[PDB]
């Protein structure tokens, strides 16, 4: 009767983990509206992040050496400096930056939470400056190089300040899957020991 | 199996009755010394 007793407690438990399933479909509803505004917006830094991958030692260092450098790739380019850390306004600072072997691996490692919101503000006042430019320009050809870093610095941005969106309901995910995972382990546990 | 769990159901009440027994120390306490102020102030009245 007491072991009995002690199972049935362990089913008063399984009556939490139905708690906890209530708990499974408030944190599959919340995740499924995340991972839809994670589709709505991450797809594209995928097919970004895959064309740096692409791009070809060739276009890039032809157009390193180049003695001026042409309207569209200057306003575009030095405003991905401005993540960079090296915030720089000068050419032979890009050219001293872009040189180094080191710069075919950083191209895809830059994250969309390192962003800070006047360096965000800045740009989105600098893409009112050169919205004609920008992936329009890129299309246009100034080089086979341009477009695809183009488009990559180009998003990044439209994840910031909408990430902040995510950060309460990221942490609250974190929240409910912590509380949620230790009691679905009590679950596995309770009916392994039932 | 079923009834004894009933009963001791009945036993979590007995549990709660224990609790109510702490209610009754509380109880005993506030109405000893309720008691004691009614002593102090009422046998005058019942010899008036």
Redesign the interface.
């Known amino acids: 009767?007491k072991d009995?007793?002690e199972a049935?407690k362990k089913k008063v438990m399984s009556q939490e983990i139905q708690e906890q399933l209530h708990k499974q479909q408030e944190v599959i509803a919340d995740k499924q509206m995340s991972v839809k505004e994670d589709l709505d917006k991450v797809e594209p830094a995928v097919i970004e992040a895959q064309n740096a991958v692409k791009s070809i030692k060739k276009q890039h260092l032809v157009e390193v050496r180049s003695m001026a450098n042409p309207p569209a790739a200057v306003k575009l380019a030095l405003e991905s400096i401005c993540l960079l850390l090296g915030e720089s306004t000068t050419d032979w600072k890009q050219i001293r930056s872009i040189i180094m072997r080191e710069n075919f691996i950083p191209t895809i490692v830059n994250f969309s939470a390192e962003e800070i919101s006047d360096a965000i503000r800045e740009k989105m006042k600098k893409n009112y400056m050169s919205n004609p430019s920008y992936n329009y320009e890129i299309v246009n050809r100034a080089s086979l190089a341009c477009g695809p870093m183009v488009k990559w610095a180009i998003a990044q941005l439209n994840y910031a300040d909408m990430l902040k969106r995510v950060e309460p309901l990221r942490n609250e995910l974190q929240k409910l899957e912590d509380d949620a995972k230790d009691n679905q382990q009590k679950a596995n546990e309770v009916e392994q020991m039932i």
């Open positions: 009767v009995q007793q049935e």
